[PDB]
Amino acid sequence: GKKVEFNDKPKVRKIPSTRKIKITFALDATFDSVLSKACSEFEVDKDVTLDELLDVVLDAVESTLSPCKEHDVIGTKVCALLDRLAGDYVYLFDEGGDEVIAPRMYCSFSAPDD
Numbered sequence: 001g002k003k004v005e006f007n008d009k010p011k012v013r014k015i016p017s018t019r020k021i022k023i024t025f026a027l028d029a030t031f032d033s034v035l036s037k038a039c040s041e042f043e044v045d046k047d048v049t050l051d052e053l054l055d056v057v058l059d060a061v062e063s064t065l066s067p068c069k070e071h072d073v074i075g076t077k078v079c080a081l082l083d084r085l086a087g088d089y090v091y092l093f094d095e096g097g098d099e100v101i102a103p104r105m106y107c108s109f110s111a112p113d114d
Contacts, residue, residue, distance in 0.1 A: 018043040021053075025090075025107040030074060031061075038064035050092045050099055054107075058085065 006013050021042045026032040038061045044053060062081065069078045084090065090109045094102040097112035106112075 016043060018045040018048075019101075020044075021101075023103075023105065030077070034065055034074075035061060044101060048101065050101060050105070050107075053101060054089055054092070058089070 007015055021044055022040065024035050024039060026035060039057060042053070042057070042060075058081070065074075065077075068074050068081070088109065090107055091111060092099075092101075092105050092107035093112050094100050095104050095106070
């Protein structure tokens with residue numbers, strides 16, 4: 001009995017030294033079902049910075065949805081993806097302005113003040 005993968009505090013009871021996030025910014029219905037399917041859950045250690053989160057997020061989505069240029073409707077996603085990887089991506093901050101990962105983080109290409 002008991003199990004071996006419980007949640008809440010480890011071993012007899014815990015989870016990985018990482019935090020599981022489920023908040024994904026949906027720009028449109030497209031990256032809604034697509035982003036959710038490719039990324040419905042993520043594990044972030046307490047050392048991962050928005051930069052790393054964005055990196056793994058972009059890589060994950062790119063890995064799952066590689067054949068995007070094939071779909072004309074989604075196509076554009078390729079141009080935007082390339083542009084995002086070019087330099088300007090999407091900044092993310094908490095409900096304050098400080099660049100930190102928390103339960104409620106605002107991910108977008110718009111500064112805190114915007």
